[PDB]
């Protein structure tokens, strides 16, 4: 793209005409600094293409980069350029800002360009900073260009302010003013206080707070999106943290609130490119709101010994109520000192059978005198416990005479009232027993239970009556309700001889007769049965012996050891005893003295 006016520079005065050509082959695009309207004209025509551009009159506001672009071809992905200057005896500046300076959005630390370009390239321009500063171009960090302006490398803080370019032409001083404006636009975050769905009365006042955060040299523009029409007022303000931080408040107020005012309210913080919007809801119209339901009231059935029990109930209310918990009625409040409140709940520490009763709960909303009491009954299970287990009955594992009537008893208590059942266990395996059972163990007379109120508790005591003790068993009484079970083993050994450990005595007439002794030892206690002779003189005793190899007649029930001596003289007579050990215990021995 060849141009008519050969070169990059051109001289021209005011009132003249421009004449530029651009001969080529394809169409050319014209680049101009200032594009007015309906002032000048242009056209374009083997056969060589030629483009041109004319101009009528001449003004200083049409001076700058003029270029013929040969880029108007998609396949051509060479351009000419030339500077055109229009001088004048009046204003030597293209951009005249004398009264009001022009605003220059800049940024600290980066490049800054001052666009106070002149018309003549020989005019000496001076750049000054308000009020007593003058920047001197050095050709490196600050470079002066009569076609472009002032180029500043790394714009520090000492360039944010009012700058002015001055030039003297024919003894007349002219000046244009510029204003560098450091400004960002970083809408950091927004937040509505409080983000909770607000509840109010039909006729109360709605108050909403929206807070914005931005750095320095930046503003926002806050607005509220409400569903209804023009309600009331809405004030906005600003606060500086002076670091680098700006805070923006926005207060929305609706003095007259009605049922229609219920809806969504959105705070919109717009500042051009970046945009933020946080939303929150508002409910209304409630007059006096108290509604209390629960979980499974009022059949709360807990068990004794429970650790960290908890009751609960759901409460729909407005506004915040005063909740006080009660027990069996009545005040209560925290009468038992244990337990705990908090959370519309009633957490029990450790549960005992005395914790039963109709737990009341009174929810008091003051400022309107709206109270609502609620009953909640609690029943504590106790589980069974057989009281006869605790009493230590000393009479060693009980042995009963053969063919004797015996009677047993087991007492237990709990909530609900537990049930008892007996069993059997022989000794050479359990058996439910009734008034015709169980072929037969021992002859059962009667099994009957009663409801006795002893030790302040309504206990239950059953009694199994053995009509005829015959076989050695182990009666088990088992008490159990629906929350636990417990049994007690009734040691029922049996004997055939009086009180166990009997000595059958068949003495002798006189000297030379026979002796027949029989020692009966109950079932399988008192192991190691034997006999003993003894006679004492002065301070000495000692026993004797045995054994005559008469081992060993065992019998259920009660074993035997018969000692027989044939033809007793005067010295073969003295004191005879039956010495037997024992299990658990605790040795026993039964004596007998006779001399012939």
């Amino acid at each position: 793209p060849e141009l008519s006016l050969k070169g990059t520079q051109h001289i021209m005065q005011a009132g003249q005409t421009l004449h530029l050509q651009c001969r080529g082959e394809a169409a050319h695009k014209w680049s101009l600094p200032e594009m007015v309207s309906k002032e000048s004209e242009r056209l374009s025509i083997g056969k060589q293409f030629c483009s041109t551009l004319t101009l009528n009159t001449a003004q200083a506001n049409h001076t700058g980069f003029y270029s013929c672009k040969y880029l108007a071809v998609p396949t051509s992905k060479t351009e000419s350029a030339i500077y055109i200057f229009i001088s004048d005896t009046g204003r030597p500046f293209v951009e005249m800002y004398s009264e009001i300076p022009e605003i220059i959005h800049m940024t600290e630390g980066r490049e800054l360009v001052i666009p106070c370009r002149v018309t003549s390239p020989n005019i000496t321009v001076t750049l000054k900073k308000f009020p007593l500063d003058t920047l001197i171009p050095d050709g490196k960090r600050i470079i002066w260009d009569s076609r472009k302006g002032f180029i500043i490398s790394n714009a520090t803080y000492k360039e944010i302010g009012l700058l002015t370019c001055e030039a003297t032409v024919n003894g007349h001083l002219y000046k244009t003013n510029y204003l560098t404006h450091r400004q960002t636009n970083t809408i950091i975050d927004v937040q509505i206080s409080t983000p909770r769905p607000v509840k109010l009365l039909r006729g109360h006042t709605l108050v909403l707070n929206c807070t914005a955060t931005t750095p320095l040299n930046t503003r926002v523009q806050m607005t509220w999106s409400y569903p209804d029409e023009k309600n009331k007022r809405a004030s906005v303000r600003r606060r500086i943290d002076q670091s680098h931080a700006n805070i923006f408040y926005s207060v929305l107020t609706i003095d007259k609130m009605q049922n229609k005012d219920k809806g969504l309210y959105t705070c919109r913080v717009r500042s051009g490119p970046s945009f933020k919007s946080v939303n929150t809801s508002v409910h209304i119209y409630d007059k006096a709101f108290i509604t209390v339901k629960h979980r499974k009231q009022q059949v709360l059935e807990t068990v004794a010994g429970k650790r960290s029990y908890r009751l609960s109930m759901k409460v729909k209310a407005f506004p915040s109520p005063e909740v006080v918990w009660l027990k069996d009625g009545l005040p209560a409040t925290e009468k038992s000192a244990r337990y705990l409140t908090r959370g519309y709940s009633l957490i029990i520490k450790d549960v005992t059978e005395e914790d039963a009763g109709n737990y009341t709960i009174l929810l008091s909303i003051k400022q309107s005198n709206v109270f609502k009491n609620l009953t909640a009954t609690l029943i504590v299970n106790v589980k069974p416990q057989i009281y006869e287990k605790a009493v230590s009955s000393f009479p060693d594992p009980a042995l009963y005479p053969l063919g004797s009537r015996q009677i047993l008893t087991c007492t237990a208590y709990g909530i609900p009232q537990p049930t008892i059942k007996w069993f059997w266990h022989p000794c050479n395996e359990e058996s439910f027993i009734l008034d015709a059972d169980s072929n037969m163990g021992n002859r059962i007379e009667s099994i009957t239970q009663r409801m006795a109120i002893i030790e302040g508790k309504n206990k239950m005591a059953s009694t199994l009556v053995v009509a005829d003790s015959r076989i050695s068993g182990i009666y088990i009484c088992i008490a159990s309700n629906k929350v636990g079970t417990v049994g007690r083993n009734i040691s029922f050994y049996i004997t055939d001889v009086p009180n166990g450990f009997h000595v059958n005595l068949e003495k002798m007439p006189t000297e030379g007769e026979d002796l027949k002794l029989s020692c009966t030892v109950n079932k399988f206690l008192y192991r190691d049965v034997t006999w003993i002779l003894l006679r004492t003189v002065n301070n000495r005793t000692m026993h004797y012996s045995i054994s005559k190899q008469k081992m060993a007649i065992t019998k259920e029930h009660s074993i035997t050891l018969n000692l027989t001596i044939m033809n007793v003289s005067l010295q073969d007579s003295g004191t005879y005893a039956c010495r037997a050990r024992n299990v658990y215990t605790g040795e026993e021995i039964l004596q007998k003295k006779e001399i012939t």
Binding site: I100, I103, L179, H181, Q183, N185, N217, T218, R219, V220, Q221, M222, S235, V236, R237, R238, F248, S271, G272, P273
Partner: protein
């Protein structure tokens, strides 16, 4: 070299003096604009009454119009005429 006592008392007694009021303090509702200059010189009541029970309050006020540059964030900036309050006469009155 030392300023006399009577000069200090008269130049500091409750009288209208030129003060540089921040514009944002007089108009906190237009938070969507950056103003230049951010402060304007205004004749406001300054000085002391030399008595803790007296306060330098205005008794005669007026209104003045100034050209302030309003800068909207990234969306144009225009010059506007904003009005401010000034004090012509000040007097010492009891507080509250």
């Amino acid at each position: 070299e030392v300023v006399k006592f009577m000069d200090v008392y008269q130049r500091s007694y409750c009288h209208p003096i030129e003060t540089l009021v921040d514009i944002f303090q007089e108009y906190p509702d237009e938070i969507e604009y950056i103003f230049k200059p951010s402060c304007v010189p205004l004749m406001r009541c300054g000085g002391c009454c030399n008595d803790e029970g007296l306060e330098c309050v205005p008794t005669e006020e007026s209104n003045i119009t100034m050209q302030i540059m309003r800068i909207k964030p990234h969306q144009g900036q225009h010059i506007g005429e904003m009005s401010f309050l000034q004090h012509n006469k000040c007097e010492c009155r009891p507080k509250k």
